[PDB]
Structure 1
Amino acid sequence: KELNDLEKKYNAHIGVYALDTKSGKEVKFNSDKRFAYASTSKAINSAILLEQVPYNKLNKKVHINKDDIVAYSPILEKYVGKDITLKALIEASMTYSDNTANNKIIKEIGGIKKVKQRLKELGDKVTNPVRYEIELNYYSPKSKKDTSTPAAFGKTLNKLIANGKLSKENKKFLLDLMLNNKSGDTLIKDGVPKDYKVADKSGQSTYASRNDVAFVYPKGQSEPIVLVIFTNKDNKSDKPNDKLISETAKSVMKEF
């Protein structure tokens, strides 16, 4: 197969970065191109919070309020003017891409400002968190706001989680969420051999920016394969096509 042909075929753009955690083999097509990462950012945001907040403390509470409410928050919507623990807050973010849960998680971290420098400290001078959800989705191929290359964002998912500074309990919490998230069944999950497991977090933005990042797990393999697939179209209101992600997933997984 060929990723290049996939672009002619689908008239989209492909940003790929696969890093085997075992071999250390890196497959990449356009991994140094900037694309809108979209809601996939919530892996980074909640991995960071897990760095500071111990698992024995995820029972803690935060009071959700009116100003904390944003469009598209399936669960947190039922908590307006109420409390909720961090665990439940982080599950909403990952299981449902709840926006109220992500923004609250960001504020607890100290704001976009903090998330940003942590990236820097992590040694990531590419990812550019500038806005909160839902605004981070208004992508413009002219701007850099809320963008990242596949190799940059790809390494960050690695350095934060795989070879992370997280605990073993937090790490396994996150991964469970990402494993049971039914939102990516028509993307990567739909393209990796039946046997492989995927801990994912997808997204979509303007310009038909459909993405999916996941920690894939081959047969008999213990170390996943970090797989960041970022894609996009030439036009603002173009409809994306998950098939392209599913197909890009299998062209690349052939190498692993």
Structure 2
Amino acid sequence: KELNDLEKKYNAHIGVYALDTKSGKEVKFNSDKRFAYASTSKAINSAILLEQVPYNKLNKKVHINKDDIVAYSPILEKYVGKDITLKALIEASMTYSDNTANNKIIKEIGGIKKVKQRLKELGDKVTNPVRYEIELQYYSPKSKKDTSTPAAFGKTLNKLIANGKLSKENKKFLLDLMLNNKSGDTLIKDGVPKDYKVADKSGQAITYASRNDVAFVYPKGQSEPIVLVIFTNKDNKSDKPNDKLISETAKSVMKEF
């Protein structure tokens, strides 16, 4: 199935970057075009924090007040005036896509500027974090704010997590959250073969049908992962996205491996 054909069928724009970490073979399609990354950045922020906090120290607590709360914080709203461990913060952001948990994580790292700084060091000059949740969800094709390209985002996910500086315990804790996440069952998880294990983080911005999924894919019989970045959008501001597009893009791309 050709990807050009998939863009016509759904009337959408597809951006893909896949890297087999075993062979180093790559599959690219509009892999240098910018798209809003939305909530898939939650994975990037959790990883960056886990580089500076050992597994044994995730029990450490942070205080949450009224001022921290942003829209769509299903777990964090129950914590106003309370303390929460860093472990529970990462779980709320990854599993429930909690917006307040993500802003607090970025604060712990030091703020948007420390995140950007870390990306530079990893060699990522493209990913451009500017706003916190939920302003980062307001995408305009005329702005570079909070956008990245499928190639830049995928090489960063490979460096941070697959070939990164995480300890065994931290890497496993994070990947297990991503494997047991039920929010991405309609995406990459829906299009790859049944024997394949998929650890993903999905995303949806408010405008232009911005629907994304990023994953670590384990083919039956291979312990090294295939990193898979799928960013898609439509032409009108108010377009509603169709998840089958991403399931189909994933089935089509996996045929190359």
Deviations 1:11-63 (A, max 9, x none): 10000000001111101101000000100000100100000011110000000
How much does 1:238 deviate?
Answer: 0.2
How much does 1:223 deviate?
Answer: 0.6
Question: Counterparts in 2 of 1:183-194, with a 5 A limit?
Answer: 183-194=183-194
The residue number in structure 1 matching 2:244 is 243
Question: What TM-score, normalized to structure 2?
Answer: 0.99
The residue number in structure 2 matching 1:65 is 65
What SS does structure 1 have at the residue aligned with 2:133?
Answer: coil
How much does 1:234 deviate?
Answer: 0.3
The residue number in structure 2 matching 1:48 is 48
Alpha-carbon RMSD: 0.5
Contact 1:39-1:133 at 8 Å conserved across structures: no
Contact 1:213-1:229 at 8 Å conserved across structures: yes
How much does 1:253 deviate?
Answer: 0.4
Deviation beyond 2 Å, 4+ runs, structure 1: none
1:91 aligns with 2:88: no
Contact 1:212-1:230 at 8 Å conserved across structures: yes
How much does 1:229 deviate?
Answer: 0.2
What SS does structure 2 have at the residue aligned with 1:226?
Answer: strand
Alpha-carbon distance in 2 for matches of 1:249, 1:133:
28
Listed as ranges, the gaps of 5+ residues in structure 1 are: none
Alpha-carbon distance in 2 for matches of 1:133, 1:53:
23
How much does 1:84 deviate?
Answer: 0.6
What SS does structure 2 have at the residue aligned with 1:231?
Answer: strand
Contact 1:18-1:228 at 8 Å conserved across structures: yes
How much does 1:8 deviate?
Answer: 0.6
The residue number in structure 2 matching 1:208 is 209
Deviations 1:164-192 (A, max 9, x none): 11111101010000111100000100001
Contact 1:17-1:229 at 8 Å conserved across structures: yes
Deviations 1:57-83 (A, max 9, x none): 000000011111011111111111100
What SS does structure 2 have at the residue aligned with 1:183?
Answer: coil
Contact 1:17-1:151 at 8 Å conserved across structures: yes
1:231 aligns with 2:232: yes
How much does 1:208 deviate?
Answer: 0.4
Structure with more of its chain in helix, by fraction: 1
Question: What TM-score, normalized to structure 1?
Answer: 0.99
Deviations 1:79-125 (A, max 9, x none): 11100100011000100110110000000100001000100011100
Alpha-carbon distance in 1 for matches of 2:148, 2:168:
28
Alpha-carbon distance in 1 for matches of 2:215, 2:64:
29
Alpha-carbon distance in 2 for matches of 1:133, 1:46:
15
Alpha-carbon distance in 2 for matches of 1:237, 1:166:
40
Alpha-carbon distance in 2 for matches of 1:221, 1:39:
28
1:254 aligns with 2:252: no
Deviations 1:123-176 (A, max 9, x none): 100000001111111000000000000000011000000001111110101000
Identity of aligned residues (%): 99
Alpha-carbon distance in 2 for matches of 1:93, 1:164:
21
Alpha-carbon distance in 2 for matches of 1:123, 1:106:
20
Alpha-carbon distance in 2 for matches of 1:198, 1:182:
11
How much does 1:9 deviate?
Answer: 0.5
Alpha-carbon distance in 2 for matches of 1:150, 1:241:
19
